[PDB]
Amino acid sequence: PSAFLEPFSASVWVMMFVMLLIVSAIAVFVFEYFSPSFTIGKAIWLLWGLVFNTTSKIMVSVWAFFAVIFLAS
């Protein structure tokens, strides 16, 4: 079968695929919005570093709950 797709996991694959994209976009937007540098160069890096083992970092840290919930699901 295919890899990293519906046959491998997430038999529905109709809601989580866009959910992850929209939450990632929201996190990237709010990382720069709550800055007081590079959007895709730092926000995405922080997200991918928090999914696995200033105030912007603190507020992005809330997304670790979503990351662990997604991993458990």
């Binding site: 529905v12 809601m15 929201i26 709550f34 105030t55 603190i58 809330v62 997304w63 709950f65 979503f66």
Partner: peptide
Amino acid sequence: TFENMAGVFMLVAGGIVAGIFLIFIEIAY
């Protein structure tokens, strides 16, 4: 899909919104 996916999506969205709102009001205050 059905009730479970919608419920978990709403729960995580509400948690994220509450966290970002708390951070925003803390920064503003």
